[PDB]
Symmetry: C2
Subunit: 367 residues, 2 copies
């Protein structure tokens, strides 16, 4: 027999919606919040270091699902040695679908079609470890059809957003009329703990990471009501050799833990241009493109600017998101795309994560 009916055009971003927990904390307030809630206000020298750390990261505010009352109800969280994964996951099991549903509802309202018209759902988050997972939970929350084709991607780290969208391109293009809802979400309560007594990596997490969810509707062959924002021309992925030790994460009994190596910015700076040329090559002056890049930190952005000889305005959307929300793992790069669209015909949407891996898409912007 023959193939099913497929799409004609490229998969396109048709809508983007985003969401954050209500608890907003500025960089200036973060030291006071973190040191109070972890019973560490007597550690003056350490607090002062954290203050200086926080000022150099390019983050101005973030949104946190956890609050003083939540942490008071869960003192095990601040104890670096206490098992507490169960309690973190229990909160995440409820909170992530709620936050994801809020972002998805806004994407669907922008899209202009009913939730019942979604045929595929791709969900990615580090902040979950359940079957049925967030993908299942969204079904009744959004009123999806029971036969929606779901993909649950637990724990894919910083490249997770781009990884999920790469999948959505193929799902959207391989069935006529397919409409894919992509959701990435991140809750930093999974990492939250008391101060370290080494090189300050929990403090790095505290200064850099925030919570959010981003939802994207992806579809080929837009109809009359739909409004394509970007076509996904190509989606690729590659590996920086000999760099798995520099960045990694895993579930533990105590929390989501890992390594945020000082090598990371340099590795990105040294390799980004070659990665893009290996990934896209034939399909493409880096200043002739637009950019939606997973920010990481101010330093990582500086590394990317330098490596690619980028003008100041090129990473502005990506920097803005970092400034306004902090790093939200997989969702961050989609916030960046959303910011870019609010602010060249061809462009690059990319994210680096553990591996080290780069996930990137070549995007074409509706004129």
């Amino acid at each position: 027999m023959r193939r099913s009916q497929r799409a004609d055009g490229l998969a396109a971003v048709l809508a983007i919606g985003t969401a954050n927990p209500p608890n907003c904390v500025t960089q200036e307030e973060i030291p006071d919040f973190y040191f109070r809630v972890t019973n560490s206000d007597h550690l003056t020298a350490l607090k002062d270091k954290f203050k200086r750390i926080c000022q150099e990261m390019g983050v101005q505010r973030r949104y946190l699902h956890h609050t003083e009352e939540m942490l008071s109800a869960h003192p095990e969280f601040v104890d670096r040695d206490a098992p507490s994964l169960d309690a973190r996951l229990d909160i995440a099991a409820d909170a992530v679908p709620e936050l994801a549903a809020e972002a998805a509802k806004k994407a669907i309202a922008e899209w202009g079609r009913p939730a019942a018209d979604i045929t595929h759902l791709v969900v990615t988050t580090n902040s979950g470890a359940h079957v049925p997972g967030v993908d299942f939970r969204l079904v009744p929350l959004l009123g999806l059809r029971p036969s929606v084709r779901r993909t649950m991607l637990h724990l894919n780290g910083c490249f997770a957003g781009c990884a999920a969208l790469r999948l959505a391109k193929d799902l959207a293009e391989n069935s006529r009329g397919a409409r894919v809802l992509v959701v990435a979400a991140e809750l930093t309560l999974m990492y939250f703990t008391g101060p370290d007594e080494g090189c300050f990596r929990t403090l790095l997490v505290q200064g850099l990471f925030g919570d959010g969810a981003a939802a994207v509707i992806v579809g080929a062959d837009a109809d009359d009501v739909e409004r394509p924002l970007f076509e996904i021309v190509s989606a690729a992925q590659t590996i920086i050799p000999e760099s798995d030790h520099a960045l990694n994460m895993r579930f533990t009994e105590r929390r989501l833990d890992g390594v945020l190596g000082r090598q990371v910015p340099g590795l990105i700076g040294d390799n980004v241009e070659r990665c893009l040329l290996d990934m896209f090559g034939p399909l493409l002056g880096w200043n002739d493109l637009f950019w939606a890049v997973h920010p990481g930190s101010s330093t990582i952005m500086d590394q990317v600017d330098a490596a690619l000889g980028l003008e100041p305005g090129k990473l502005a959307a990506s920097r803005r998101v970092l400034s306004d929300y902090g790093n939200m793992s997989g969702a961050t790069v989609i916030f960046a795309l959303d910011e870019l669209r609010r602010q060249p015909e061809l462009g690059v949407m990319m994210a680096f994560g553990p591996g080290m891996t780069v996930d990137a898409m070549l995007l074409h912007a509706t004129s």
Copy 2:
């Protein structure tokens, strides 16, 4: 921007299991000794019954007495031990997966360098970089292989990964997708509970394994397609999330194995298949559901009996699925791929068939297959 022309096809299947084989006859003694539980005479009786009567004859386990001695906290139901289990799995899963993958590649007949996409699924890991990244140097994949790592998708995981593979293979010309599902039961291993028997079920029914599949459209002269994937679909049984679930905990991978599971499958399977495939199941035939071949995730003999009774299947239809249960036990997402492989060595045979798996949700993932 060059797409494939025709249907995605299964081009090779390769499987692997840990070397330690354990028969159902020796399991009761072994388990009750190693968990210091020999005084629980009646509990062990329940366990014997579970081991003898639910359709499993042998299993392959990565964990051994030696490994259990080195990790006594595994045996303690209250001790945090997720780190130690995950540390073992970080190394063992990619090795087992690599063995299955290499057999699939050898059957396939092209070099590993020709693989363009990799889709990996396991309950037995929680790492970034994950098993997918680890397989790159193990198999000699190109660094630019497009990887998808699906942690913790339960029993439907193998079917869900193949659903992805179909679209990946069909939307890019020349694309060749390696799909691997692997499962290690040391993730769940623990001592028994006298009041409740969910642990006894896991210890009686679940085994370890890895299965690998090469998926591609537009077969070469050198490739030998085994099955074309006509359609891949998924659906939900309403009001059944309480019956069956799983999660990471501090102590182990844990969950619920409800009494109602076989009955829910029996009550809903026919409706699910008809919802999922619709007009594609039109035509006849002469034997209704017996017109088709079947590769289904087994679960238990009762679950297979429920599928039989629901679809009016003759004894031979689920024989390949029951044989897998018998020879390997349940290996989560990998099991239905073992079933497809058994079916393939078993073979006028039906042209059209269903490959399906039920998991938490409850969800069914299913593919309509055309054998060529």
